[PDB]
């Protein structure tokens, strides 16, 4: 019963803030060029860009590269979000976050070069096996709790928690990716953004919201890892939102009592009554029955044996990812959106 590991976490976080602020103030820009990399294959796609596997030609190292079409980013009102993404990424440091290695831009596109995580998305693994066991789910949930404790101490909200954005590394640990919607926020913010299934009630109701929306998404994630489907689903988004705001959730018959209790406290529609956002903060979650067998330090130190390790076929193997149609990356002769992305 010696929680002076609390004082140790407090000391760690105070230091992490110093480091963050130092990097936040003097951000890195244009640390690479497009033809220093060999484009190999598409790992994922979006409305305003794509993510590719690339090979740094000098060093031979593989990376993931996110390519955003400036014109499409402007068209889709994502300018501020992409500047958030890069600025936050370059200033953070935590064992369960994908690391930004380089960023740059040319006439047509923004580029962010980051760690490649060859184990693929949690999403694919979960859909294939159906559901994870509670120990297996708990393993990942523990990493997300530590990650949000880190991010929130720096006033960062992540805002896109879902299996799709959690990659699994060679040791079975989580690497959080896609900081597209991440924002530094002291107090409230107002943008309607996220994935419908994972949207907190405050977001849906356009009232102004804070870091508590991430603890809500954690409830949805733990539920989906353990159930195999999310707590609120429907054919169309509109029906999903109505379910989210209703205050009604049903749990599989195989959910433990402890898990059901945790999830009722995470999926509280009133944010003032939600775990993570009460007086004791994250400690309400860390000290909850369901996490009773969790060694929080050992998990941070990566000393716990992972319940599942993806198949590794070598560096540059992408068999844990789906196939996407390929498109040649064209760079225009004329600079597009120069003013909009001058800070990038």
């Amino acid at each position: 019963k010696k929680g002076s590991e609390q004082e140790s976490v407090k000391e760690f976080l105070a230091k992490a803030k110093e480091d963050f602020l130092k990097k936040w103030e003097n951000p890195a820009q244009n640390t690479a060029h497009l033809d220093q990399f060999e484009r190999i294959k598409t790992l994922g796609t979006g409305s305003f860009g794509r993510v590719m596997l690339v090979k740094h030609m000098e060093t031979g190292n593989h990376y993931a590269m996110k390519i955003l079409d400036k014109q499409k980013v402007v068209k889709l009102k994502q300018i501020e979000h992409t500047l958030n993404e890069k600025r936050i990424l370059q200033a953070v440091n935590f064992p369960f976050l994908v690391k930004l290695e380089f960023s740059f831009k040319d006439n047509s596109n923004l580029y962010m070069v980051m760690e490649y995580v060859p184990g693929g998305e949690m999403f694919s693994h979960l859909r294939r096996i159906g559901r994870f066991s509670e120990p297996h789910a708990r393993f990942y949930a523990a990493q997300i709790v530590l990650t949000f404790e880190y991010l929130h101490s720096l006033d960062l909200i992540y805002r896109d928690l879902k299996p799709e954005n959690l990659l699994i590394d060679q040791q079975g640990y989580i690497q959080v990716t896609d900081f597209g919607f991440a924002k530094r926020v002291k107090g409230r913010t107002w943008t309607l953004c996220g994935t419908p299934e994972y949207l907190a009630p405050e977001i849906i109701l356009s009232k102004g919201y804070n870091k508590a929306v991430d603890w809500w998404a954690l409830g949805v994630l733990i539920y989906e890892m353990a159930a195999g489907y999310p707590p609120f689903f429907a054919d169309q988004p509109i029906q999903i939102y109505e379910k989210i705001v209703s205050g009604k959730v049903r749990f599989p018959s195989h959910f433990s009592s402890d898990l059901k209790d945790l999830l009722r406290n995470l999926l509280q529609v009133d944010l003032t009554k939600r775990f993570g956002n009460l007086k004791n903060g994250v400690n309400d979650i860390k000290n909850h029955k369901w996490f009773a067998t969790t060694d929080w330090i050992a998990i941070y130190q990566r000393k716990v044996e992972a319940p599942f390790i993806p198949k590794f076929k070598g560096p540059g193997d992408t068999s844990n990812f789906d196939d996407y149609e390929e498109e040649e990356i064209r760079v225009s002769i004329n600079e597009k959106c120069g003013k909009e992305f001058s800070e990038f």
Partner: peptide
């Protein structure tokens, strides 16, 4: 069962953000 209804809905695949 809720699992069969989930497979029956159109939302078992990779989910896009709303964007905006």
């Amino acid at each position: 069962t809720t699992y069969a209804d989930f497979i029956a809905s159109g939302r078992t695949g990779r989910r896009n953000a709303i964007h905006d």
